[PDB]
Amino acid sequence: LGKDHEILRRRIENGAKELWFFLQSELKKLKNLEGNELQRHADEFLLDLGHHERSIMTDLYYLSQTDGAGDWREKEAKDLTELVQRRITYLQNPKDCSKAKKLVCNINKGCGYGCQLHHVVYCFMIAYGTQRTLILESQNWRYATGGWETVFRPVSETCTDRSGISTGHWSGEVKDKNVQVVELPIVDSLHPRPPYLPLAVPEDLADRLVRVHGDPAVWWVSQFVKYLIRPQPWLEKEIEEATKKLGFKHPVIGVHVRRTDKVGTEAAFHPIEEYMVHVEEHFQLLARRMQVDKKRVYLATDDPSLLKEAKTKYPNYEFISDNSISWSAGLHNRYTENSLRGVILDIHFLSQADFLVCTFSSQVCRVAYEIMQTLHPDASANFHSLDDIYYFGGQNAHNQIAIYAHQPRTADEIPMEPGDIIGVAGNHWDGYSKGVNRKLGRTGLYPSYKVREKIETVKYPTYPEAE
Amino acid sequence: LGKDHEILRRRIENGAKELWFFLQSELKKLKNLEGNELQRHADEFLLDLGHHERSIMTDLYYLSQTDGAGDWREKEAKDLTELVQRRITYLQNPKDCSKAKKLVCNINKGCGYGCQLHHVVYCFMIAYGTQRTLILESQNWRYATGGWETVFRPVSETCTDRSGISTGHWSGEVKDKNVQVVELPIVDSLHPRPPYLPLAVPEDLADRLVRVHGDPAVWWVSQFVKYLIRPQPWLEKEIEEATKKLGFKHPVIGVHVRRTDKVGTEAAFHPIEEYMVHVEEHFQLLARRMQVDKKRVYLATDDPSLLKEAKTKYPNYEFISDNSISWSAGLHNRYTENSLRGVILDIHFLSQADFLVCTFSSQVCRVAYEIMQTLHPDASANFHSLDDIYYFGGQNAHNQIAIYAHQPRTADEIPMEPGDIIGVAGNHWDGYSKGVNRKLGRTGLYPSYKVREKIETVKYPTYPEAE
Ligand SMILES: CC(=O)N[C@@H]1[C@@H](O)[C@H](O[C@@H]2O[C@H](CO)[C@@H](O[C@@H]3O[C@H](CO)[C@@H](O)[C@H](O[C@H]4O[C@H](CO)[C@@H](O)[C@H](O)[C@@H]4O[C@@H]4O[C@H](CO)[C@@H](O)[C@H](O)[C@H]4NC(C)=O)[C@@H]3O)[C@H](O)[C@H]2NC(C)=O)[C@@H](CO)O[C@H]1O
Numbered sequence: 001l002g003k004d005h006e007i008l009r010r011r012i013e014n015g016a017k018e019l020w021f022f023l024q025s026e027l028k029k030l031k032n033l034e035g036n037e038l039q040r041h042a043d044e045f046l047l048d049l050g051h052h053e054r055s056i057m058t059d060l061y062y063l064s065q066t067d068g069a070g071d072w073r074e075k076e077a078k079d080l081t082e083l084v085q086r087r088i089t090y091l092q093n094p095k096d097c098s099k100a101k102k103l104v105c106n107i108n109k110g111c112g113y114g115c116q117l118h119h120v121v122y123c124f125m126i127a128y129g130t131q132r133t134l135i136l137e138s139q140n141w142r143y144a145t146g147g148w149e150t151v152f153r154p155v156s157e158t159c160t161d162r163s164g165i166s167t168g169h170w171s172g173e174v175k176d177k178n179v180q181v182v183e184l185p186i187v188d189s190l191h192p193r194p195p196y197l198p199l200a201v202p203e204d205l206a207d208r209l210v211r212v213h214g215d216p217a218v219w220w221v222s223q224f225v226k227y228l229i230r231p232q233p234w235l236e237k238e239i240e241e242a243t244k245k246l247g248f249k250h251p252v253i254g255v256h257v258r259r260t261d262k263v264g265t266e267a268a269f270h271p272i273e274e275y276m277v278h279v280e281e282h283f284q285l286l287a288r289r290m291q292v293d294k295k296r297v298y299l300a301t302d303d304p305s306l307l308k309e310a311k312t313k314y315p316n317y318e319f320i321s322d323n324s325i326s327w328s329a330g331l332h333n334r335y336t337e338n339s340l341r342g343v344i345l346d347i348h349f350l351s352q353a354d355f356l357v358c359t360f361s362s363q364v365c366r367v368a369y370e371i372m373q374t375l376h377p378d379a380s381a382n383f384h385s386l387d388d389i390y391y392f393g394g395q396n397a398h399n400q401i402a403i404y405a406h407q408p409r410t411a412d413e414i415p416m417e418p419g420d421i422i423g424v425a426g427n428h429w430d431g432y433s434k435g436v437n438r439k440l441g442r443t444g445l446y447p448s449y450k451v452r453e454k455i456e457t458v459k460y461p462t463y464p465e466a467e
Numbered sequence: 468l469g470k471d472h473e474i475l476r477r478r479i480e481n482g483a484k485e486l487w488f489f490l491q492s493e494l495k496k497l498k499n500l501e502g503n504e505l506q507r508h509a510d511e512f513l514l515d516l517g518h519h520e521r522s523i524m525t526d527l528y529y530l531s532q533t534d535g536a537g538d539w540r541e542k543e544a545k546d547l548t549e550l551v552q553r554r555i556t557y558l559q560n561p562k563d564c565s566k567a568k569k570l571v572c573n574i575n576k577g578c579g580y581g582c583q584l585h586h587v588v589y590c591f592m593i594a595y596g597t598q599r600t601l602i603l604e605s606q607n608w609r610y611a612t613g614g615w616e617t618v619f620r621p622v623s624e625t626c627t628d629r630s631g632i633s634t635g636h637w638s639g640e641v642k643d644k645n646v647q648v649v650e651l652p653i654v655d656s657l658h659p660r661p662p663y664l665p666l667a668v669p670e671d672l673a674d675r676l677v678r679v680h681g682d683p684a685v686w687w688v689s690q691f692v693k694y695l696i697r698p699q700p701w702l703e704k705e706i707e708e709a710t711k712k713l714g715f716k717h718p719v720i721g722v723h724v725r726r727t728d729k730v731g732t733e734a735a736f737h738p739i740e741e742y743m744v745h746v747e748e749h750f751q752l753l754a755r756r757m758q759v760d761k762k763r764v765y766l767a768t769d770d771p772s773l774l775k776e777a778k779t780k781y782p783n784y785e786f787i788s789d790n791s792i793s794w795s796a797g798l799h800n801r802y803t804e805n806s807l808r809g810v811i812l813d814i815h816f817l818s819q820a821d822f823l824v825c826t827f828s829s830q831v832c833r834v835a836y837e838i839m840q841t842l843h844p845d846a847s848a849n850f851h852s853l854d855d856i857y858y859f860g861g862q863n864a865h866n867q868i869a870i871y872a873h874q875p876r877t878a879d880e881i882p883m884e885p886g887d888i889i890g891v892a893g894n895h896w897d898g899y900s901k902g903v904n905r906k907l908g909r910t911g912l913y914p915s916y917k918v919r920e921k922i923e924t925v926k927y928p929t930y931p932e933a934e
């Protein structure tokens with residue numbers, strides 16, 4: 001055992017005890033207070049708590065890094081990335097393209113970039129499970145009629161032709177076993193659904209992923225995003241120039257403010273203060289472990305009027321943003337190459353940030369979060385979503401397993417016994433989540449800490465020929 | 468890295484986050500409440516917090532045991548105990564007693580048992596540092612004029628005689644370098660003081676002890692307590708019989724209620740409910756990790772009227788206690804052999820408990836806590852004192868090091884800068900401690916989590932010939 005490891009384990013332990021002592025004392029005092037006297041004492045209480053809590057989260061971070069734990073995790077995560085990218089690349093480049101089994105994917109799903117991009121990942125992940133090379137049809141793409149290679153590398157160097165001796169629409173892996181070329185529709189109309197879908201992960205990688213990553217389901221998705229978004233040279237160069245142009249440096253926290261057409265249809269309007277309370281919080285945590293020269297924020301939004309508002313309200317912050325990109329994201333000009341290049345750039349810098357504050361109901365932020373997983377060993381917790389938990393459109397039921405019992409205090413809560421399977425709908429970021437107790441068919445709230453994630457595994461191919 | 472180790476570290480991490488989510492939300496709710504509604508909401512809040520907090524402490528326990536950490540810590544602590552006991556036995560049994568260097572200690576210090584026992588421990592630690600054999604004079608002992616061997620084994624098998632060519636009173640290790648037999652007074656009037664005192668530890672054991680034990684200073688003391696209290700055969704049998712008669716079995720929590728002459732002089736009167744809130748708390752913690760057949764408590768007290776009160780007020784508890792021993796602890800019969808054997812038994816069963824709730828102002832509980840350290844790898848946190856932190860009468864200044872800054876919110880608090888040395892006087896068990904900032908000469912309260920223990924080391928002899 002490590003000297004610093006035990007020191008840290010005990011400092012975290014004792015720090016929690018003192019926190020419990022602190023809580024009990026101040027609450028007993030609070031029960032005897034009223035009005036402003038009550039409200040000021042509660043505010044001072046909250047300030048003191050945040051620092052204490054952050055001291056514990058800092059000791060927890062150090063524990064995750066002490067005694068070579070950080071060095072090992074990066075090497076293993078690196079070995080895992082290399083392995084998958086090696087298998088994907090092998091699958092994507094058969095010797096004889098005319099005789100390879102293929103799966104055709106059409107990019108023109110009726111939605112935005114991140115949603116269309118997730119369609120390709122959904123296509124790619126099933127092509128992986130079926131040992132079929134992915135063929136991506138991207139002509140007449142709404143962001144770029146020139147197609148996929150307007151921005152990114154082709155998904156294959158040897159097999160980009162879709163010809164085959166037999167062709168047909170999706171009907172099942174078994175039924176299509178002797179069909180060379182299979183056309184795959186969007187997940188919304190996929191029947192029958194195969195098991196190669198989120199949030200499951202390859203059975204052969206399950207044990208290694210749990211040791212490294214706090215959310216393997218996102219990591220698995222990120223591996224296909226990592227492959228797809230290989231930039232064309234001019235795009236690679238422009239990212240390199242934008243990085244230098246915007247003075248993009250660390251430490252930096254990424255913020256995605258999705259407004260415009262999303263409001264009133266798939267999400268709500270969130271004031272800028274709802275985002276910045278968590279940015280400031282995180283900078284207070286990082287300050288506990290390093291020197292914060294300047295409080296930097298990369299702001300990605302389709303509201304071009306927001307940057308002036310933000311700079312006005314937070315003058316001690318350095319806001320890094322491309323307002324012309326935000327303007328290009330406008331509804332009247334959203335579906336062009338220039339706007340496409342804009343959102344690609346914004347997502348890149350969001351993914352490169354040290355922390356991500358946004359709304360996961362927007363696919364733009366979910367992509368940045370996914371890419372982030374490829375830049376760090378375990379960046380699963382390096383975010384805060386103002387609404388939805390992480391999800392992938394079309395995923396199988398996101399389930400959890402109750403580990404502690406719960407008796408409802410109100411009719412709006414649901415009971416839980418250890419072992420109950422809970423299908424989570426979301427986290428309210430108030431200590432409570434919302435979901436259904438499948439055993440009872442009741443829906444309602446439950447404490448977010450009394451459940452555990454039910455990790456799903458699928459027997460994927462392992463492509464041993466790629467070594 | 469171990470799979471379960473990482474799972475636990477992340478679950479501790481997330482549990483703290485969800486606790487932080489829970490706190491902010493419910494506090495925001497509390498600021499808008501009044502009257503009974505306010506007090507009901509705070510009480511329900513505390514119930515939810517205790518369980519949540521205990522769920523985190525349980526995972527922290529598992530972390531201390533995962534991946535063979537429990538087996539290693541148990542093995543290492545065993546080798547350290549055997550090593551020190553091997554050295555002590557070597558020092559205490561020279562071949563030629565007539566030529567050995569000796570240090571004479573008289574047991575009849577004017578105080579109770581635990582205080583007199585600490586006198587011998589204080590004598591023993593200095594004899595150890597000076598490479599002198601301890602000769603214990605225990606005639607006219609107030610609990611047993613027959614002497615030390617009425618209950619315990621002699622401290623030496625070869626050298627119990629005090630003869631020597633030169634004798635003198637204590638005057639310094641340097642001045643006594645050629646004085647064979649040195650007489651040592653009580654610490655309260657000791658001049659000059661040697662460095663072989665609590666709460667310092669041998670320089671050669673610092674790294675190994677910090678790695679294993681959460682409070683090395685107590686472990687060091689416990690090694691001398693362990694040696695002294697080696698029971699005579701008839702005493703060993705009596706304990707074995709009492710264990711069987713009292714149905715002493717696990718799980719069990721030890722409770723020491725010191726009253727009578729202590730109240731109003733060296734401590735305060737504490738109702739039984741103040742003790743049982745922490746007993747119940749821990750049984751709620753233990754239930755999270757094991758099957759708790761029955762909530763057992765071993766009650767040691769000098770108030771013979773207390774046992775019936777407890778049985779009446781807590782009918783769901785099984786109280787193990789010998790009331791005739793409590794009667795023997797009365798002021799008119801305190802200093803007899805029958806009473807002496809009684810308190811020895813009480814301390815034994817207190818030390819054997821899985822947790823110790825008491826007042827550390829009573830030397831009776833400090834001995835049980837020390838002995839407890841010899842029964843487990845790291846039992847440093849297996850206690851709760853209603854008043855004083857751990858201390859050893861005559862210790863050098865117990866100092867701490869501030870790790871986080873603090874700005875006083877009231878005049879009753881003191882400021883701290885990181886690295887400042889703070890002389891601790893005690894912990895108020897409410898999130899605040901009390902002490903003096905030696906850099907400023909200011910005394911007052913400060914957050915208990917912003918400080919770190921300054922572990923002190925002393926170059927003791929190592930007795931390499933004992934191998
Ligand atoms: C000549 C002779 O033979 N002398 C012996 C003594 O050696 C023998 O033992 C001595 O007993 C005393 C008192 O039991 C003990 O003193 C303590 O030393 C502690 C360490 O420095 C110190 O912290 C203690 O002070 C607390 O308690 C006293 C009251 O006893 C209060 O007045 C103080 O304010 C302290 O109160 C604590 O304060 C903190 C912070 O405010 C609180 O967190 C905590 O809850 C408070 N606790 C209480 C109970 O209020 C105390 O001064 C000696 O260490 C000890 N010495 C030795 C060598 O054993 C004595 C035993 O009866 O008999 C004499 O004949």
Ligand SMILES: Nc1nc2c(ncn2[C@@H]2O[C@H](COP(=O)(O)OP(=O)(O)O)[C@@H](O)[C@H]2O)c(=O)[nH]1
Nearest residue numbers: 112113114115300301302329342343362363364
């Ligand atoms: N450049 C840029 N474009 C954005 C931003 N937010 C939204 N957009 C545009 O709006 C589209 C929304 O499509 P989508 O990726 O499916 O995300 P969602 O509809 O918010 O879930 C994006 O693809 C962009 O074209 C932004 O912050 N920056």
Ligand SMILES: Nc1nc2c(ncn2[C@@H]2O[C@H](COP(=O)(O)OP(=O)(O)O)[C@@H](O)[C@H]2O)c(=O)[nH]1
Nearest residue numbers: 579580581582767768769796809810829830831
């Ligand atoms: N048998 C028994 N005796 C006790 C108990 N509590 C106190 N006493 C007696 O009271 C004395 C107190 O002396 P001491 O050990 O120096 O500790 P302190 O005065 O409580 O700090 C003890 O030595 C016992 O003789 C108890 O729980 N059981």
